[PDB]
Amino acid sequence: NADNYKNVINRTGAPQYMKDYDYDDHQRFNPFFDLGAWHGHLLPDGPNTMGGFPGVALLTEEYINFMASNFDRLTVWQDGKKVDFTLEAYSIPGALVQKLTAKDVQVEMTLRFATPRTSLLETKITSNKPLDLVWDGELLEKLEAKEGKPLSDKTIAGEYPDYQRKISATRDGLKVTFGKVRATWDLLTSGESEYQVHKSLPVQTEINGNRFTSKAHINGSTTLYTTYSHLLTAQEVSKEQMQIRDILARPAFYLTASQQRWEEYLKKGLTNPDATPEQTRVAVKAIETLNGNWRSPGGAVKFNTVTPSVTGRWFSGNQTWPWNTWKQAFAMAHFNPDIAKENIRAVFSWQIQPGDSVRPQDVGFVPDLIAWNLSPERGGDGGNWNERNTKPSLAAWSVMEVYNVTQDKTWVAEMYPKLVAYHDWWLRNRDHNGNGVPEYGATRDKAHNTESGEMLFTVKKGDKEETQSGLNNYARVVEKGQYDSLEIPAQVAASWESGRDDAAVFGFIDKEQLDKYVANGGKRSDWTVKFAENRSQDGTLLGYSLLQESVDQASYMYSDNHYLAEMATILGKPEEAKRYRQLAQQLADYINTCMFDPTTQFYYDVRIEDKPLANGCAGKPIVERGKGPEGWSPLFNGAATQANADAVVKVMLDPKEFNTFVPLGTAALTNPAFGADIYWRGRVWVDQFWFGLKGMERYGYRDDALKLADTFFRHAKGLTADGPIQENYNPLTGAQQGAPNFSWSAAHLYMLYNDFFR
Ligand SMILES: OC[C@H]1O[C@@H](O[C@H]2[C@H](O)[C@@H](O)[C@@H](O)O[C@@H]2CO)[C@H](O)[C@@H](O)[C@H]1O
Ligand SMILES: [Ca+2]
Ligand SMILES: [Mg+2]
Numbered sequence: 001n002a003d004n005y006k007n008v009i010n011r012t013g014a015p016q017y018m019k020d021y022d023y024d025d026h027q028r029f030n031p032f033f034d035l036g037a038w039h040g041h042l043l044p045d046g047p048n049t050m051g052g053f054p055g056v057a058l059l060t061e062e063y064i065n066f067m068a069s070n071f072d073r074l075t076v077w078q079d080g081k082k083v084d085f086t087l088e089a090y091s092i093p094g095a096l097v098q099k100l101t102a103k104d105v106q107v108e109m110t111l112r113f114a115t116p117r118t119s120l121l122e123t124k125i126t127s128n129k130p131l132d133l134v135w136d137g138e139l140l141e142k143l144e145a146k147e148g149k150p151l152s153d154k155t156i157a158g159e160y161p162d163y164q165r166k167i168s169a170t171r172d173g174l175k176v177t178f179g180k181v182r183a184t185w186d187l188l189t190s191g192e193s194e195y196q197v198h199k200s201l202p203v204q205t206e207i208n209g210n211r212f213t214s215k216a217h218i219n220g221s222t223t224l225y226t227t228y229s230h231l232l233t234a235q236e237v238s239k240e241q242m243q244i245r246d247i248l249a250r251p252a253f254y255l256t257a258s259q260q261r262w263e264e265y266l267k268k269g270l271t272n273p274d275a276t277p278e279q280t281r282v283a284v285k286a287i288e289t290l291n292g293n294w295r296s297p298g299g300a301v302k303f304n305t306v307t308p309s310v311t312g313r314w315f316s317g318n319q320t321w322p323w324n325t326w327k328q329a330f331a332m333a334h335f336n337p338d339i340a341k342e343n344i345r346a347v348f349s350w351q352i353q354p355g356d357s358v359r360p361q362d363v364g365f366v367p368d369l370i371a372w373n374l375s376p377e378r379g380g381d382g383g384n385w386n387e388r389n390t391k392p393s394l395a396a397w398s399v400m401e402v403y404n405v406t407q408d409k410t411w412v413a414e415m416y417p418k419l420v421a422y423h424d425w426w427l428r429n430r431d432h433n434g435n436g437v438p439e440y441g442a443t444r445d446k447a448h449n450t451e452s453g454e455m456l457f458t459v460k461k462g463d464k465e466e467t468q469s470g471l472n473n474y475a476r477v478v479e480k481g482q483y484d485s486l487e488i489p490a491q492v493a494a495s496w497e498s499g500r501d502d503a504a505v506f507g508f509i510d511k512e513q514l515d516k517y518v519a520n521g522g523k524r525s526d527w528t529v530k531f532a533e534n535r536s537q538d539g540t541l542l543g544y545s546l547l548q549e550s551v552d553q554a555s556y557m558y559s560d561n562h563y564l565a566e567m568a569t570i571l572g573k574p575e576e577a578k579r580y581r582q583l584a585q586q587l588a589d590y591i592n593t594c595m596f597d598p599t600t601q602f603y604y605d606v607r608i609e610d611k612p613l614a615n616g617c618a619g620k621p622i623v624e625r626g627k628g629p630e631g632w633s634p635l636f637n638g639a640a641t642q643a644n645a646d647a648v649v650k651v652m653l654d655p656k657e658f659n660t661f662v663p664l665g666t667a668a669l670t671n672p673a674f675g676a677d678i679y680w681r682g683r684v685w686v687d688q689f690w691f692g693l694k695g696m697e698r699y700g701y702r703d704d705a706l707k708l709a710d711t712f713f714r715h716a717k718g719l720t721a722d723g724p725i726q727e728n729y730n731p732l733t734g735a736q737q738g739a740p741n742f743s744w745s746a747a748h749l750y751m752l753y754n755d756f757f758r
């Protein structure tokens with residue numbers, strides 16, 4: 001029953017700016033989106049907005065932008081007297097509801113989504129008398145504010161002179177048309193996009209600049225239906241008309257469709273009724289959040305996908321990342337498997353294929369960021385599309401969870417080959433020393449190297465920034481140490497490839513931190529990163545590797561290999577199954593032999609040193625750069641021996657290391673590069689926390705995992721309030737940072753509800 005969970009997130013708001021941002025540039029209100037639609041709605045905040053759902057949020061290809069404060073807001077007149085209504089408004093999973101109550105007239109408005117482009121409003125009017133209905137709307141004028149305060153006096157029309165918004169009428173409603181705007185970071189339209197309003201009765205619409213007023217007379221009680229459609233191309237506009245007509249012909253079919261779909265999400269999803277009411281509401285919040293970030297096919301992305309946040313400054317539209325998808329799809333397999341499947345298809349739909357025009361050397365590669373608009377390199381004008389790096393190998397894990405739920409063999413058959421191609425890419429383009437253990441690295445890209453193939457880097461000394469190129473040059477510079485710091489685009493890309501941007505283990509340490517490290521008796525050379533080019537015997541530059549093998553990716557590949565073997569077995573490929581099991585076993589051996597340090601009782605990346613060690617390992621574990629969440633990856637993924645897991649868990653539970661106010665953060669308190677304000681050098685993310693708890697359970701420490709989950713529930717700020725889900729937490733204070741409505745936080749909070757709030 002969706003009605004048991006009213007207002008889990010605050011969805012009220014009356015936007016006054018196209019960009020009505022919070023402190024960190026995210027839209028500061030939380031509109032309701034469903035069915036992968038490309039528009040969203042808010043609840044009225046009071047008398048000024050009652051009668052409508054203010055703040056039509058448009059997803060303009062890659063960004064969320066508000067269109068209007070009031071739009072299609074109802075006012076009711078009875079014999080020339082304006083009805084003064086009492087307002088009650090709330091959200092439930094799958095709907096917005098607004099009730100307007102007066103003596104002689106009552107209105108109940110229920111807003112649900114009907115198609116991937118269309119929301120449906122039921123306006124149920126009860127009256128003992130005929131009434132005159134007036135709907136009004138006005139497009140926004142002002143561009144941008146922060147925390148409700150204008151950032152400039154720019155106007156929408158001033159900033160985007162080609163936008164040239166215009167309202168037009170039809171017999172059953174109205175529409176807004178939009179000119180072509182290609183503002184790479186702000187506002188992207190085709191020139192054919194429209195926002196259409198159609199109703200189940202004729203209305204008389206007048207237009208005055210960027211305002212409208214529509215009228216209708218009714219003889220008494222009636223239920224009216226209204227469709228709202230954001231359509232992004234001429235082809236979408238044409239296709240949606242038949243759906244709109246069907247919706248207005250049989251609105252009950254669509255309302256029931258949405259009611260039933262949401263009853264199923266909650267029935268399948270809420271499988272821990274012994275959780276506390278507050279814990280259950282957190283799960284419901286997570287479900288609402290995940291489904292709201294789902295987007296239907298659009299532009300270059302021909303599948304339903306899920307983005308990190310529909311309200312996010314840089315996460316909105318249909319911008320899609322691989323390891324976000326793997327995590328989200330894993331969680332959503334347990335309540336919305338149809339879309340989990342789609343999301344996985346969306347990512348792999350842009351896997352690099354043989355003969356690729358841009359990077360034929362990268363067959364099997366999965367781009368880091370795909371979106372509506374292709375990059376200039378692929379013939380589009382998209383500024384977000386990114387092929388500098390991929391993300392870690394969690395794909396097979398998510399594919400197999402969708403199979404576990406659906407038991408659909410056709411699914412395994414379609415994904416298996418894409419998973420294999422991805423695996424093969426790692427081993428061709430990210431294994432410099434040919435030992436079957438991957439490195440993180442960087443593709444051949446304008447960001448990383450010259451046209452002729454020389455790696456870029458910048459030397460900084462005082463106020464000087466000296467851009468340079470060439471690996472030979474880089475090696476000479478670092479041996480010599482004549483600089484204050486270095487900026488290396490390939491290093492940044494390697495950290496992005498791990499998903500842990502600017503993490504300590506990849507050589508990221510601030511000047512003060514490094515100075516303290518050296519003062520304490522460490523060497524500056526302990527933090528220098530080395531690189532190698534990966535080149536085929538025929539001269540083709542494949543990319544760059546960090547001369548470092550990372551324990552998380554080794555562990556993820558280990559489990560990925562075992563899932564591949566499970567898929568091969570299901571598909572009657574016994575030899576391929578054997579090969580993946582054997583590859584998995586070798587990775588476990590390497591992880592335990594090379595990446596485990598018995599002295600500090602933890603796992604670490606290893607260097608690829610000039611010569612291998614006596615035990616065959618590429619180099620020693622990088623104990624100097626401190627402990628991080630990669631250290632429990634061998635537990636999560638099942639690579640660790642029991643003895644090694646025993647050791648790791650002791651460190652996890654040590655308040656000196658990871659057992660902080662909010663525990664299991666992204667660097668131990670003992671890590672020389674730790675900061676409680678640094679995203680991937682101390683802050684706690686829900687994915688890495690849950691990976692830790694699952695790792696603990698896998699090796700016999702479930703009871704300890706339950707205690708850490710309880711500590712998280714008590715100390716993570718905002719968890720039981722009605723605010724949107726964010727990205728991470730301060731490990732010392734529990735304070736939140738990051739984009740609101742963040743998908744993988746929602747994913748892993750949901751799985752924490754499922755697995756560890758018990
Ligand atoms: O561009 C690919 C990288 O994007 C990063 O995500 C955000 C980033 O957090 C934000 O600060 C801003 O720069 O936009 C980016 C998306 O374009 C990822 O964290 C990084 O790993 C890469 O995927
Ligand atoms: Ca290697
Ligand atoms: Mg019970």
Ligand SMILES: [Mg+2]
Pocket residue numbers: 375376382383384385
């Ligand atoms: Mg670009």
